[PDB]
Write a protein that binds this ligand. Structure first.
Ligand SMILES: O=C(NO)c1ccc2ccccc2n1
Ligand SMILES: [Zn+2]
Ligand SMILES: [Zn+2]
Ligand SMILES: [Zn+2]
Length: 572
């Protein structure tokens, strides 16, 4: 009931009762808020409401102080002071951006733009409010009850009337009952639970409604610049493998935090594990939002770092299968690999946070709260995919607004830039360099002469909203007959429904653009499916085509992105 103002830290008993996070607001800032928003309920030890029996006046602008009690204009005593006077709300110990964050529905892009351009304390308020609004929104969808169990990987379901049905993709992990978490894909719905239980008919699955904890630590700690490497001890016997990053590792020891922008295949994993070989005594915590990103870092460490000094932290509510070669849950091992949401309360000499475009300000703050380190290193690429914002429907979110780190990388630029792509054929590197990296990404490989583009709009069908283009899958099928080396290709598309149709017809392994991020394949077959804002997104486009080591076939719908592709044009 007594804390500090979320706008100027001025100690106060006042909290906004109309805010879903009930932030402490000082007399000056509380007034500026209630006089401009629909928010008029003010909370103290006792609420600011009319004390007169059966009176429902709760608006602080319509209330007055009767000695030590509160009353409306109809019930106030002769000697009373309005709670709102001279730019203040009465309380003990006696902003336009805060009003917008506190009242927005988080469905517009301008809401997220503001959540990142605001002050630091408002970035945490925006992050808490957004995350709590994302969870209260989970109470809105309808329950699915089992009607029939077809097999071990398929079932038929009954849906709740009056409440809408949620998107059937691997993104929306349902929580079933206490049989564990369960996922779905499209009347024969394919079921895939984290736990393998012979599902009983009549059982029900409901979405993961978790409670949002408050944020204390900033998204980014205040920057410090040092004259020498601080708290870290370099090697002199440094493997020629990592000699290219020595100057950047030294810059890491001479700053509190450092940003590394690394386009696809420029050596981000290599940079992260080499930093451990450069400061060999340093205790490093490797973190990322996804289990896949943390696992990718584990594969690189297995190759260069002693397997005994490594540990993979796995939480009890195990949703996906993880890295199995390190000792599990040993918080004290020199090298700790763990996802943001499972981080223990520990300290480190260096913290490395990878796949930084996928992080939210909620995640940035959590890392600063659970880990107290001498140095922080943010590795990622603002030209790659951000975390999905489930409430955002109106407008497109730009990279300088993904999180505080991406905002820094897109405005002041990154501290370090890995400029040479070692993975992709030159056709792909030249296209993405011009598309998203301002011609600064250089190709290490020559042109493979296996990068093709075909302009084919086909026919667009929709399974609810995930789009399908059967003629584009047919064009791929025709190409494969004439190109058997492409038999070993991974099929990629912006839609899971397209991928389900392509897996049945082509039999190729399948990946959405979003789930392909971080991975690499010799051959990639990409069908754009539609020319929507989703499939034409340049960050998704950049990710889609930078998955290929040898060859890529792009069946395009957008003339703009087709014309930008510096690939060999095909006909049929
Ligand atoms: O070792 C690596 N991964 O296997 C790697 C990848 C990409 C690189 C790019 C430039 C310099 C070095 C690199 N190293
Ligand atoms: Zn204040
Ligand atoms: Zn409010
Ligand atoms: Zn009253």
């Amino acid at each position: 009931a007594v804390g500090a103002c979320v706008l100027c830290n001025s100690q106060t008993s006042l909290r906004c009762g109309a805010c879903i996070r009930r932030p402490f607001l000082c007399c000056k800032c509380c007034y500026d808020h209630v006089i401009s928003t629909s928010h008029k309920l003010v909370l103290s030890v006792n609420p600011y409401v009319c004390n007169a029996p059966g009176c429902d006046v709760t608006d602080v602008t319509q209330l007055y102080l009767g000695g030590m009690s509160y009353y409306c204009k109809s019930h106030k005593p002769p000697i009373s002071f309005p709670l709102c006077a001279n730019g203040q709300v009465f309380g003990l110990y006696k902003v336009t951006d805060f009003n917008a964050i506190a009242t927005c529905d988080w469905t517009n892009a301008g809401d997220y733009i503001l959540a990142n351009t605001c002050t630091e304390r408002l970035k945490l308020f925006a992050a808490e409010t957004l995350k709590a609004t994302e969870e209260t929104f989970k109470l809105s969808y309808g329950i699915a009850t089992v009607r029939e169990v077809l097999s071990d990987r398929e079932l038929h379901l009954s849906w709740e009337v009056g409440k809408p049905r949620p998107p059937l993709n691997r993104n929306y992990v349902f929580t079933g009952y206490q049989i564990g978490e369960y996922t779905f894909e499209k009347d024969a719905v394919v079921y895939r639970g984290t736990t393998t239980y012979k599902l009983n008919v009549g059982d029900y699955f409901v979405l993961t409604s978790h409670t949002v904890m408050p944020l204390s630590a900033p998204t980014l700690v205040p920057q410090e610049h040092y004259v020498r490497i601080t708290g870290l001890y370099p090697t002199l016997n440094i493997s020629d493998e990592f000699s290219s990053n020595v100057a950047n590792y030294q810059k890491v020891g001479m700053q509190k935090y450092s940003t590394l922008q690394g386009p696809p295949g420029t050596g981000k994993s290599h940079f992260a594990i080499g930093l451990a070989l450069y400061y060999p005594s340093a205790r490093i915590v490797y973190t990322a939002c996804s289990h896949a990103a943390v696992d990718a870092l584990c594969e690189k460490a297995l190759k260069y770092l002693p397997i005994d000094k490594c540990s993979r932290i796995i939480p009890a509510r195990a949703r996906v299968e993880c890295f199995d070669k390190f000792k599990v849950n040993s918080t004290l091992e020199q090298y700790v690999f763990c996802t943001v949401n499972a981080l223990p309360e520990t300290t480190a000499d260096i913290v490395v946070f990878d796949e930084i475009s996928m992080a939210t300000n909620y995640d940035l703050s959590v890392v600063n709260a659970r880990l107290r380190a001498k140095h922080y290193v943010y590795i990622g690429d603002p030209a790659q995919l951000p975390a999905p914002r489930t409430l955002l429907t109106k407008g497109t979110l730009e990279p300088e607004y993904f999180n505080s780190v991406c905002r820094l990388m897109k405005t002041i630029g990154p501290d370090m830039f890995l400029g040479t792509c070692r993975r992709c054929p030159a056709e792909i590197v030249d296209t993405v360099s011009a598309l998203v990296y301002d011609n600064k990404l250089k190709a290490h490989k020559d042109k493979s002469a296996q990068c093709f583009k075909m302009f084919y709009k086909g026919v667009i069908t929709h399974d609810v909203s995930s789009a399908i283009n059967r003629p584009q899958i047919g064009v791929v099928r025709e190409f494969l007959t004439r190109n058997p080396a492409w038999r070993k290709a991974v099929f990629i598309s912006p839609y899971n429904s397209q991928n389900a149709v392509a897996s049945k017809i082509l039999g190729l392994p399948t990946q959405t653009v979003d789930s392909s991020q971080g991975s690499e394949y010799d051959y990639v077959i990409f069908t754009q499916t539609t020319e929507t804002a989703h499939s034409c997104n340049v960050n998704r486009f950049n990710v889609a085509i930078t998955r290929a080591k040898v060859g890529i076939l792009c069946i395009m719908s957008d003339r703009d992105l087709y014309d930008k592709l510096q690939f060999t044009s095909l006909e049929i």
